[PDB]
Amino acid sequence: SPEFPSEKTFKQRRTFEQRVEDVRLIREQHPTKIPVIIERYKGEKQLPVLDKTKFLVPDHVNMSELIKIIRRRLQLNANQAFFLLVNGHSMVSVSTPISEVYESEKDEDGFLYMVYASQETF
Incomplete structure (x- = not known):
């Protein structure tokens, strides 16, 4: 309903240069953590x-x-499908550590973006 505002994404909430600086801090302060943005498909x-x-x-x-972990955060039942996509492809079969997904897939701003949805292509 146009009565309500549209959903805004992380990249719309924070400018590129803000995100860059945010990832610079995380990488220095938490070197063994990967900085990940997880969002529902629009x-x-x-x-x-x-x-x-x-x-x-x-x-x-x-x-x-x-x-x-994300199915748990969303409180999903086993009847609900859930797909986790990185740059247009599904992450279920990756199983490498997320460290390797970061190295392959991270955004220019330094965050790794993921989008979740009830179908694999969309």
Whole structure:
């Protein structure tokens, strides 16, 4: 309903140069954490909104483990599908540590962005 404001993403809330500086601080202060932004896909109509956007993920966590963590945060039932996408592809089969996903996939601003949805392509 146009009665309500549109959902704004992390990159709309914080400028590139702000995000850059935020990641510079995290990398110095928490060197073994990966800085991850997790957001619901803009067109998603089944899954609820996440109660946190910016996560400091220990670098040894793998994607199977991260999927369980976000399904838990969202309080999903086993009947609900959930897909976690990085740059247009699904993370379920990655299983390398998130340290390697960061190195391959991180944004120019230094955060690793993920989008979740009830389907794999969208």
